[PDB]
Amino acid sequence: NSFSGYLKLTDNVYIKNADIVEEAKKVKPTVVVNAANVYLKHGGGVAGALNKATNNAMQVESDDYIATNGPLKVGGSCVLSGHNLAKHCLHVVGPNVNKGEDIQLLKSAYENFNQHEVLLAPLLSAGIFGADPIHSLRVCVDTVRTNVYLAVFDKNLYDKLVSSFL
Numbered sequence: 051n052s053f054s055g056y057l058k059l060t061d062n063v064y065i066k067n068a069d070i071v072e073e074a075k076k077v078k079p080t081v082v083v084n085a086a087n088v089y090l091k092h093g094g095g096v097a098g099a100l101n102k103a104t105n106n107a108m109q110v111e112s113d114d115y116i117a118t119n120g121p122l123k124v125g126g127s128c129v130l131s132g133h134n135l136a137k138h139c140l141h142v143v144g145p146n147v148n149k150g151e152d153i154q155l156l157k158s159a160y161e162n163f164n165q166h167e168v169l170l171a172p173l174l175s176a177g178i179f180g181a182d183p184i185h186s187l188r189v190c191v192d193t194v195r196t197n198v199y200l201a202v203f204d205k206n207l208y209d210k211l212v213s214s215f216l
């Protein structure tokens with residue numbers, strides 16, 4: 051958990067303009083969060099990037115988890131290996147509001163972070179899930195009580211988030 055270059059937004063939420071794969075490789079945190087779907091198919095966005103950085107080891111492990119346990123629920127999570135990126139990966143399913151999943155479930159999704167004292171994470175339901183990223187940061191601040199280090203790849207989005215918050 052050798053985090054550096056973060057800006058503290060609240061007592062427990064930190065933010066950085068960084069690629070989450072590069073942060074994970076540098077810091078080797080105890081927990082990296084994946085923005086997953088219910089079948090843990092890591093095809094694009096942050097999930098595709100983390101899986102590619104494990105050279106598809108995350109996808110083979112995820113398929114075995116699904117074969118034995120079934121899919122996750124929207125707002126749910128599971129803990130799997132973090133491979134070369136972290137001790138553990140917490141796979142969390144935010145709602146896909148573009149497909150009619152309820153935005154109320156974004157609070158349930160962020161509640162999974164509270165089971166871990168320190169996490170490196172992306173914003174949930176941003177990107178192809180369709181939630182407004184600034185609303186997702188507000189839900190993170192209002193819900194997460196443990197220490198979360200958020201990595202935002204896009205500089206234009208990062209500047210917008212820091213301006214709306216601090």
Ligand SMILES: CCNc1nc2ccc(C3=C(C(=O)O)CCC3)cc2s1
Pocket residue numbers: 069070071095096099172173176177178201202203204
């Ligand atoms: C080059 C490998 N690293 C990465 N590939 C991506 C792809 C998408 C993203 C996304 C967001 C983010 O900053 O969390 C919000 C919307 C999609 C981030 C990354 S880091």
